[PDB]
């Protein structure tokens, strides 16, 4: 029915926190995913 694109920049040690049921500074205070999440998480290095 609908698609949502959540776009943000994070750090490598924190990329593991963008997943359902995760803990951490991002998962607890910045972006928290629900336990029943039905989606995909995509990440790529942006050093350039």
């Amino acid at each position: 029915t609908n698609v949502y694109a959540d776009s943000f920049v994070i750090r490598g040690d924190e990329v593991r926190q963008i997943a359902p049921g995760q803990t951490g500074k991002i998962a607890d205070y910045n972006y928290k995913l629900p336990d029943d999440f039905t989606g995909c998480v995509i990440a790529w290095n942006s050093n350039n």
Binding site: P20, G21, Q22, T23, D35
Partner: protein
């Protein structure tokens, strides 16, 4: 109270499954024992009559 929901939920589901299986065993045993008591009660009513 000590484990985070995303991981405690699995332990809860496992305990629920085990306890539900225990309740199902109790209910089945009671259904058989009730059938035995019913047969005995029918015999008792026949003897009374």
């Amino acid at each position: 109270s000590r484990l985070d929901p995303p991981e405690a939920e699995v332990q809860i589901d496992r305990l629920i499954t085990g306890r539900l299986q225990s309740l199902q065993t109790y209910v089945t045993q009671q259904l058989i024992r009730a059938a035995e008591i019913r047969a005995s009660a029918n015999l008792a009513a026949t003897k009374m009559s």
